[model samples]
Target chain A: LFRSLVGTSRAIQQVRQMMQQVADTDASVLILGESGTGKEVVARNLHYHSKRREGPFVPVNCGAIPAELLESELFGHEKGAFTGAITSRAGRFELANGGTLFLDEIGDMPLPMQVKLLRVLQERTFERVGSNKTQNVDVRIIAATHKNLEKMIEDGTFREDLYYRLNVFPIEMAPLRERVEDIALLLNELISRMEHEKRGSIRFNSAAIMSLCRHDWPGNVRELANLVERLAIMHPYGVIGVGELPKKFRHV
Target chain B: LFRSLVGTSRAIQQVRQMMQQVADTDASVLILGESGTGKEVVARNLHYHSKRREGPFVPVNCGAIPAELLESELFGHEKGAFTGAITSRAGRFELANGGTLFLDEIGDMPLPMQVKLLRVLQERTFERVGSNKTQNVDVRIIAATHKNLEKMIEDGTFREDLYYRLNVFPIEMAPLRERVEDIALLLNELISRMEHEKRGSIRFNSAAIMSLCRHDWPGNVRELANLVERLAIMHPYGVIGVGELPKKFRHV
Candidate 1:
């Protein structure tokens, strides 16, 4: 269900090697990158190839949930804990026990939750929102964020101790601009994957590929993937050249 | 309630001048900017400073609404239009009949709705869903999007005719990084506004200001605004220096 990093750039190769190194350990790992740079992909790789490969790999987006409910969301909640408590529930931490818990966008986690997370890392235990009983879990953490945590720590938005605890082993995903040489390869992989899903089929001519590579992708790989899928649906079974590409890509 | 665009940068001055030139006219305005760069402010500025200022100014996020409901949301729904329609209602077009209709994230409007929007822009006429009655609205349009419409058009997701209709008087909000020189002034305006709202009070030292200016603001003015508000709450009465700023800012 997983594929390789799909590039030959030194940056990606180094990341792959580090993923292997950290996969065997139980130490907390931090993955950093700009939004849409495939931070979760790296995290998933670490989990799938780890000693706890058979365990559940649960993921949660720290930024997408509301601040008031984040604590119960991450560490489970007791029935009647708050206004909407229909029943007692388990959080991402409990579900990922004996496996990896991917905390996507850890930078956006509220300070109060950060303190609780720090304790979990230090003690390997946590309690539900209204329950007094503590629950222990043998879970590995892999956190990711697009924000500059170091800056956040200085600004006091994020905790320093939490930062240190999560940053034990770090993996930074390189932006697309830095790996222009790998765009062609990545495009091929993405295109084939789209075809396999019965999305559509379209091939890029040399000039079209060159045009895509020349464009500075501010939105990174996700943007490229979107464009390719769009073009596939628009001109399925066609060999697209520079003239057939998007106006932004054609400008160069 | 709207103040002048707060900045001394040439980019903002140019935008202000453009806004003034187009405000008195009934031309459709297109605003392009990254998220958090305040596209809605530009739309509101054009409306409030116009001859129709006394009329209601209605705003709708085209992207936030689901595709199936956008048409009814914008054009209103007649009683028995669908399963959920218990009573007839007017949409944004009717509400802003003599004023401005700010369409936020216009780029994300689905293809089918794009055709309907084009007709509305062309003839200023629309019919409520499930009704044969056509209604005329004397509303001016102000559309904004962070996505590249030019690219979307090339990829066939956006209609070309609608693009030309909306692009009549374009106003592009410069990303925060491009207007780094305006950071100090913008911060002052933002902080003063926060104090007025009883949020809190804080001051930035010269070193902190310089550090902030030197850093590349990926999140743009919105990012800067958020940081300022957070700092105000974090260091309410204190003067913040480089030491107090986030670590990334200090290093730069």
Candidate 2:
């Protein structure tokens, strides 16, 4: 049960075209976009269309995991590895051995981890958090970030070598406001999805739609989705007019 | 309840000296250093040693909370403020009233929140999310950040006024790598804390100590604490040589 990317704008079409070209080559893929632009959608599309579609897709939000916990998180800890690691478990890398590991916000990863991750990418082998034994893994990497990797490199917070390695095939997702033509289609798609799932649905007046389309979606589609969800709850089975919208969206 | 600054090194001693110098003042204190360099530790100590010790010591990590929720989190939401606001609640600002509110990662505060927070600090008054009833507060603010606020101000992500508001009586924590002399003392302290808790204990041989001292602990004392905890679990009640440490610690 895969949810395909829902937009048909030329911006999305470019992403689809690139997905077709590199989905099966096992080359490292980098997806860059602003926060909430659904970089993971492109990442998932690549994995789903790839030959290893049968394999797992493990996504890790590198931005959220604290630096102290990230090491053992990516590499499973041995039982008794650290004081609180009572039970041994497979890390994301170990679990995704025959699959795709989507690293979201690669730029937020600390400099020390960049070196460790770089080494793993180059060698295809790594040790568990406390174990010295090396384990070989076969997994494709699809890293995503909303940051400027070049700027981070200049600031010495990121490594350039790692950037070149992960940037083998880059696909940039346009922000939702940049693809306003797709907003109508996305709104309809999301409304129907909600209805199909028996969540209450709401329709939007022409003025409502026009107002939303004109306002810059700073949080991108993610913002639109939340607005839709809120409207569904506030005006279930009803229609939304410009006056019913949040003041922030009334950019008129 | 006071856990005084533990290190005896000249760097930490300088921090200790500064703490004593400003412990009784009402000035806003700013602690700076790399992540895990005990910025919070300094803040907590400052509060404990200050006249506000009888009051609460509340901490809020600005970087961890989502920007969307930060406003209401810092400023309490009234009952029925939003869909999920079924019960009126106190925000960190209200809860930390008449006490010390330690804002960690202050540089990471969104620009909008920075404006709101700056207003609260300047006016010493605020209101709940859904109400306009102004309330007064007497809070001793102690903010800490690993980031350079001047750089952030230049980037336009942080407000310059807020930086000036919290930058009074600044104290910087030295990274662990810079104070290698503290490693031996920290190791012993962590070991005893673990042992006092009835966790198993381990000792480091001369070579093991040397190895750790020479290694660059990018993660700071926090990193050393984890390594010590792991070593205790891995070699319970045993002595560790250089070879026993994780490869990263074997600088020799």
Candidate 3:
């Protein structure tokens, strides 16, 4: 299920290091890169493939939820946690006991929430949003964000100690443009695997590869994945070319 | 006296074109650039060279005046117009009748004042802030600002019609770093002028000039002017090197 997740050569090297280093240790990991760089995928792989593989793997996008909902999402909720809580529910920390909880786009998390998160990480204890019952949950934390956390720390937007706590082992994923040579290999594997699974048939010609190298992917791999899906649907026959790309994506 | 202005080549060419085109027109002109770009100097030069040279050149800094007093400053009221109304007085427009009224930092002008200015330009008539009696004032209005007027228009902070009315002929002064060759000439001329005015004597050697070129001046010419003035006072013996430059301005 996660083969193509490390299809590119650079990604393979990073993943191999992640597996060897992260399998036996209880060390926390912080993944940093631009949006769409597959930080969440790496986190998912680390949690499920390790000794804590039996534990639940949960992913949270801190930026998606409003400030009000974020605290409740991280910690569990009591029977009446603010407005919508009708029944007590186990939070991500409680659900991922003895496993790993991945926090995505951690930079967007408000400062107030960061203080609570820091306390939870420090003591491995948390209470429900509306309840005072201290729930001792054991969980390995994995966080990721594209934002400059160091700069944010300097700017007072992020807590310094929380960053230090989470940054036990940090990995920076390389951007696609910086490693364009890996694109052809990755695309081929994506197509071959999809074909084997009866998902779709896709191919990339040389000219298309050349064109792909020139594009400035501000959205990175997530953008490429979306484009690939579109191409497979549009042209199921064979290779995708530069002309098949959206007008804006074409290199002038 | 005005020869101290920087960049004789491109700046001189622009001055000639402005003189030729605006020497006879009554259309409003706008000068835009960052602070320390010498916007008022350009406004003065334009007003003095134009056909309105015979008429008084009235200058008003919208930022300097309080919001309450701005109306009276622009459109003079009759005796007892407001609390400070000791006697009847003409506004900037009436004072510079048949001449030019230059408004500096126009982006800082209040929205109500913008409407008043726009109406006056449209109808060629205005009633003082306190007086109901209408009067006709013949004056060419030129406005300047160091702001994104387009953004201001979208934000509803600036009047669109007023912006368009004052934007007949827009002149943008390039920053100092972009035209680095002008630095040497500006330095020498400014130093000589200051020497004549008994300000002080300050000189730069080859290394200092090289360092000056390497700097990325975010503040533009105004930054340069202030640095030159400071150097002149500090090193009155007329000799300074890169080592003497402030930390932020130094290349290494």
Candidate 4:
């Protein structure tokens, strides 16, 4: 994904400051937010802005991949490790050595994997699947999840020890509904970027923007972007009034 | 999948009562709760207790399948519908005729599917994919999601109209952490059922049971079940003291 984050709200403004402040440090960073709220973008921005920018940035979506397969996905696997390990491969930690390893959807990781991960986080090393030899890792960690991790801890699904390990430095990307002040700013940037890309162009009047603010933003900025694209498709080079929005967004 | 819900706490006691009372009705049911909080079990229980028990109980995990494949999965698909289409097939709707259709993870459903589902729910009819033949459906709808659907509506990912339609009768399953009273009840049932099955047997003394209740039940009753299985395996035909549990569950 593109590593750009745009918004003028206090939530994002401080996020930008935090990103720059700790980009040079090697402490683990944990990002909290709902899906589509630019958590990935924040991780990427921090990766690019950091001193290790020249190094690789490897990311694994802890939830998208299945629990069974993820054991080898994160840690390298040797040929013939299991039923279908045809070739030896390096894990993300090795690939991300001297760089950043972003663990997205960290909350979805199972307790078994959580224990293994905590061990690695503490020892800074892991062995490849099916290998007895241990290897050292030097990647900085950045984890993000849409889940309520603390609640998960309360629910006993997440490990409190791993939670403390990954959350050495915390960053929260507030949902768009909470960052109402940034909606217009983000909407404008989204439109201008699309126009610059020569994809159709459209504008939303202040009244329409205000109505949008009145609505809920469960999907956050990504949802906002998708909506902007839809509007652009419907009204190329056309100005959008409050009446132009789908009924739900026109509450005002 | 087993469809058995066992508990003596007021929360689950009322849930069981509600299930029997409304199982005979055809009103759309919306279940709200976190994952593993027995929402699916409730849906299954409702189906089994209903008059439609003789008919098929169809469930589709909206979040598990991809957006594209789900289109055909929920509605019938015709041969030659797409490049890979080989045979004319009935969707869950057709299979669920004269029975219950459970839409799990409704919050993760894409907007396009939401709109299509709304149309079908409103018209009680739908055409097969790649075929223009319209078929009438006769099934009670029970939709569930671990996500906050109301928040999804605010995020613009969910349709307000669709939300209003699916939520005719709302049933809330509170998280297990909040329903702590049920922990001991569920734990006993879990162990007794396993022991009856001749798998193994174990006992949780009051100290151990109390500790389990005090701990967070993030995985809900399911987590407790998994823990009980683990304990049975660890100490076969043994009595469990507080120390037998993993340190975290011994909060008290």
Worst 10 residues of 3 chain A by lDDT: A1-10
Residues A81-136, candidate 4, lDDT per residue (tens digit)? 87656557788788889989999779978899999998998898899999999999
In the predicted model 4, the residue pairs found to clash are A155-B217, A155-B218, A156-B218, A216-B154, A217-B154, A217-B155, A218-B154, A218-B155, A219-B155
Q: List runs of model 1 lying over 4 Å from the truth.
A: B1-252
* lDDT of model 2 at position B110: 90
Model 3: residue B26 alpha-carbon error in angstroms: 2.1
Candidate 4 residues lying further than 4 Å off, grouped into runs, are: A1-4, B1-252
Going through the candidates in order, the fraction of native interface contacts each one reproduces equals 0.00, 0.00, 0.00, 0.00
DockQ of each: 0.02, 0.01, 0.01, 0.02
Candidate 1 pairs with clashing backbones: none
- lDDT tens digits, residue span B15-39, model 3: 5565446545565678887786767
Q: Tens-digit lDDT track for model 2 on B1-252?
A: 555567778989999999899978989999999866888778878888888888899777576566777888899888778765655778898888878998977887899999999899999999989989999888899998878899889989888888888888899899999988888888888788778966567988889998898988766787677677556645668899988887878986
Point out where model 2 deviates above 4 Å.
A1-252
lDDT of 1 by residue, A1-252 (tens): 346787999999999888888888988899998755778778877888887788988877676566787898888988778865655778889999999898977997999989999899899888999999999988889999888999999899999999999999999999998898888998998889877966567888888888888888866786777677556634657888988786978746
Q: What i-RMS does every model get?
A: 14.6, 17.5, 22.7, 14.6
- Model 2 chain B is weakest, by summed lDDT over 10 consecutive residues, at B227-236
lDDT of 4 at A25: 89
